[PDB]
Amino acid sequence: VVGGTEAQRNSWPSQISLQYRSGSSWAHTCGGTLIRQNWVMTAAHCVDRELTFRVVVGEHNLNQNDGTEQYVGVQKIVVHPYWNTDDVAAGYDIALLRLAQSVTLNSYVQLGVLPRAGTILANNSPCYITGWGLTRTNGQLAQTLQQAYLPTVDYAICSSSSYWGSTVKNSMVCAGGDGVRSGCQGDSGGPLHCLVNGQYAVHGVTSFVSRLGCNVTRKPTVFTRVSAYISWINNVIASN
Ligand SMILES: *C(=O)c1cccc(C)c1
Ligand SMILES: [Ca+2]
Structure with a gap:
């Protein structure tokens, strides 16, 4: 986000960080929205790569322990069937991620x-x-x-x-x-x-x-x- 301000840590509890495995570490690549305790909505283009993904809920600082994070694997990726990676202007840029576990809801983690x-x-x-x-x-x-x-x-x-x-x-x-x-x-x-x-x-x-x-x-x-x-x-x- 260009020209933003820092969010309060309980403002946007449905925001997730979508991360991929890089060597021994994890890298943030995209956002998403938690829409069920075990489903995230994101962009199709974010999961075009054949990577290992995880979702972080309750995340505020990518670089520091917030004391609120839950880390969960992605079990299934369902991209919209009309998505074409060569044609982002055609639309259908949406995907659903089924999480390996259901996350726990609180002031930092909501649908x-x-x-x-x-x-x-x-x-x-x-x-x-x-x-x-x-x-x-x-x-x-x-x-x-x-x-x-x-x-x-x-x-x-x-x-x-x-x-x-x-x-x-x-x-x-x-x-x-x-x-x-x-x-x-x-x-x-x-x-x-x-x-x-x-x-x-x-x-x-x-x-x-x-x-x-x-x-x-x-x-x-x-x-x-x-x-x-x-x-x-x-x-x-x-x-x-
Ligand atoms: C989002 O991260 C993003 C920025 C620029 C262009 C695209 C397609 C996506
Ligand atoms: Ca953190």
């Missing part, structure tokens, strides 16, 4: 609330992106979980020629684009939390930013629109 199917946010709706991704274009991961206020940019604006054009689909949410605040590498897969009727819900799964840079004016961060995938998510959980 993410998803929107009702079909819900579309008004232009300029208040949202926060969260993650441990790079804090500058071509920079380095955050140590502590970051948040940035990224108001939505509706499909009509986001898909206009001065923004993303035909690269954005109605199956996506755009947010931000102010040139200061954005998602960045390492935030992919994580949530966009939007305040609706007094409650935060996870409306987006971070999918991409511009090849030119993270915080680029009129290139808002692009997310998979969770409300387009409610039936798919329910069908996967019910069949696994």
Whole structure:
């Protein structure tokens, strides 16, 4: 997250760190949202590589003991069947991870609330992106979980020629684009939390930013629109 602030450690208890094994260590690669005690929602592109993955819930500082973490293996990966790694602009950037154990819930570990199917946010709706991704274009991961206020940019604006054009689909949410605040590498897969009727819900799964840079004016961060995938998510959980 470029232009973020440090989250409070109990603000976003559905945020997870998706990590892969590197030698004798683990490296953060992506975010995700805990949606059942044994299921995480992330981006398909985050699990394209044939790596060993684990999820960390209750994580605040990637580099320090928080006293709240639970570490759990990934047992099954279900990518959306229309996902194509060569075509992130086509959409379907969503995957479900079945965890090897069910995590324990507390103030640091909670299920993410998803929107009702079909819900579309008004232009300029208040949202926060969260993650441990790079804090500058071509920079380095955050140590502590970051948040940035990224108001939505509706499909009509986001898909206009001065923004993303035909690269954005109605199956996506755009947010931000102010040139200061954005998602960045390492935030992919994580949530966009939007305040609706007094409650935060996870409306987006971070999918991409511009090849030119993270915080680029009129290139808002692009997310998979969770409300387009409610039936798919329910069908996967019910069949696994
Ligand atoms: C997320 O980590 C991410 C950043 C830039 C581009 C892509 C496709 C994903
Ligand atoms: Ca930690």
